[model samples]
Structures are given as structure tokens and as C-alpha cells.
Target: KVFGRCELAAAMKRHGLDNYRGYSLGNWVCAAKFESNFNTQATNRNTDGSTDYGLLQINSRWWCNDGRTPGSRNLCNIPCSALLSSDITATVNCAKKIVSSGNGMNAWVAWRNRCKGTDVQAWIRGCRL
Candidate 1:
């Protein structure tokens, strides 16, 4: 499912992404915009053979088990396929784990290069939190 900007903002906020780990909802929204453009079925295969899946692009190497990443830790303990669901609850939960694991929002290079150190307020400008 592809979400409108405000819809995604509200969804992430509802799932505890607002102020999660000192990052605002805008940060999450902005990251999602860059990561998957709010499309739940987004997928990308890394040059290292790991794959990124779903809205937040949770990676197979360390988060989800794709049965392809040779040394996958599967820390989220879920199949990579689960991230593709339109119900974003699982994706949000896994993202929480990624942030709380001390990687912070920088776990996503898109966030690091795009959302970080910027006025991300624009990402959620018209969204009601």
C-alpha cells in the first residue's frame, strides 16, 4: 500500500514513532519518504546479497531472515516477507528494535544523508500529530 504523507505521519505517530529515540515524527516520515516512498511493498537487494524490505526498508542481514543472507542474525525474528504487509505494525516494531539497538535513525543511510541535520518539519508540515 502506498500512503499519503499525512496518513503515514499519523500511522507512525500512532505506532510510537513520535519522539522515538529523540527523533521526531518528521524524521521517521522523512526517512520513510526516502527509504520506500511510503510503499509497503518496496524491496531492494544490497550489493552484499542482503535485502531491504517494506516501508522502512528493514534489512535482511541483521533484522529479518530472508533465507538468503548467509549470516543473517534475524534479530527481529521475523521473515523478510512479513515486512511487505500493508499493515505496518510489524515494520514499525522492527524499526523500534533497530533504533533501540543503538543504531539510532542513522541505521538508514537515506535518513543519514537526507533527513539528518535538516529541517524535517516539512516532512510532516500539514499532518496532525
Candidate 2:
């Protein structure tokens, strides 16, 4: 909730997220807005028994493990708790790996739903990084 568009873009750039994996910074910024409103501690449990974690709402089914949840691939090899850090280092790292593996930011439902094919230029209109 603390991060705005420009600040998020700057942070993404600082973490080497700008244009990483062929995805634009606007993609990350927009996704973050809808996913968790940039809140690190966000989590949601779905009826399918899968849970979403962190700002990008990474799923427990394939990404992080929530300890009690079953059948998690835990592909990122990081605890689900680590993704909830306010620093966003762990979150960005895992997100980059996901994108680089051909996920193309589509791994995030928020990106596909709210950010895809939209005018995302405003996310970085005034930010210089």
C-alpha cells in the first residue's frame, strides 16, 4: 500500500526488473497495483485450495510453499514467508525467474486481467530511472 507507480518503477529498476525478461517495467508496476496494491503481506486463499502470496500473488500451487498447504512445487525454493518482505527483494527475484522461464508476466492473473493490452504508459510517465 505504500508504493506508488513512480516509486515502484524506481524500485523495480534498482532491482534490475526494468525490461528484464522482455517485459516492460509498466507490466510489473501495473500488476503490482492490482495484485496486492503493492502490499507485501497480502495473501488470498482460493476455493481450489491454492493460496496466493506476496505482492504479485504468486500461487502456492507452483511457486512458494505456505508450510501447511499441500502439493506445492515450490519451484522458487523460497519459503512463502520470504516473499512477504517489505523490501521486495525476494519477491522481485522470484518474479524475474518466473518471467525468464517464459511465463512472460502471464503467471500473474492481475497482469492479464488489468494490465494487459492497456495504456500502461502512465505508470512511468514522470519517473526517471
Candidate 3:
């Protein structure tokens, strides 16, 4: 399977990394808690082993792979979600796209609204996506 920065725990872990460390880190935590409770670098392997996706908890068919005109960075090799990759930027960007689409992660904006930048607190809430 295609592997992507599973060791970049800082990217997937809560409050880790350097540049945008706080942003990505916080996001990872929130997304983790939101998705799978901070299971840093975890995967849901299929029985065939032909489809092992990455973090952001992405599925092969959803983002890439299949004869469905597959397209993406780690499409073929890593059929998993960005939830497991050290590609923090891509992961966060992916989330941003999802969030911006107004179809998901709106909670992130709400969570940010709770804290204006100087307020460091772990805020939790439900999502409609």
C-alpha cells in the first residue's frame, strides 16, 4: 500500500509540528477527536489489502483509485485518507477545502470563533456534516 508520513505524529497529534504547528496540530486533534478520537496515524485496512488509505480518514474510491478517473497526490500507492500522512499541509488543505465547501468542518470556524487567537482552550462541539 502507499504510505504517507505516518511517522509525522506531530502532524496528526494534538498541538504538534513547527510551522503552522499550532494550526495543523490543533486541527489534527480536533479532526481526530471529531473522526476517531486522536488515533494518530491509524488505518482501516481492507481484507484484500489492495486498498489501504491514509489519514483525513480518506477512502480510495472517494478521493482516488478505481477506474473512476482516479486523481490525487498519493492516489494509487496510498489509497487511504490523509488522516495518516505527515503531509500536514495537504491534510489541512484538504480539510480546508471540505470546510470551505460549506459541506463539512464548519465546526472549525465555530471553534475558532470561540477563540480569537490568544485564547488557548480545547473546545468541543457537534457537526452537521
Best by lDDT: 1
Number of the top-ranking candidate, with TM-score as the measure: 1
Q: Which digits, one per residue and each the tens of the lDDT, describe model 3 over residues 8-124?
A: 334334332322423434444444443433443655544543332334444444343433324434432433444455554545454544444444443344334433353222422
Model 1 spans with C-alpha error above 4 angstroms: none
Where model 2 places Cα greater than 4 Å from the true spot, the runs are none
Give all candidates' CA lDDT scores: 0.94, 0.84, 0.40
Better of 1 and 2 by lDDT: 1
Comparing candidate 2 with candidate 3, which one achieves the higher lDDT? 2
Q: Estimate the lDDT of model 1.
A: 0.94
> Candidate 3 — which residues are off by over 4 angstroms?
1-28, 45-55, 66-83, 106-120, 123-129
- Per-model TM values vs. the true structure: 0.97, 0.92, 0.39
* lDDT for 31 (candidate 2): 91
Summarize candidate 2's per-residue lDDT along 37-113 as a digit string, tens digits.
88888989988898888888888888888886687889898888888887889889889878877768887888998
lDDT over C-alpha atoms for residue 52 of model 2: 87
Clashes of 1: 0
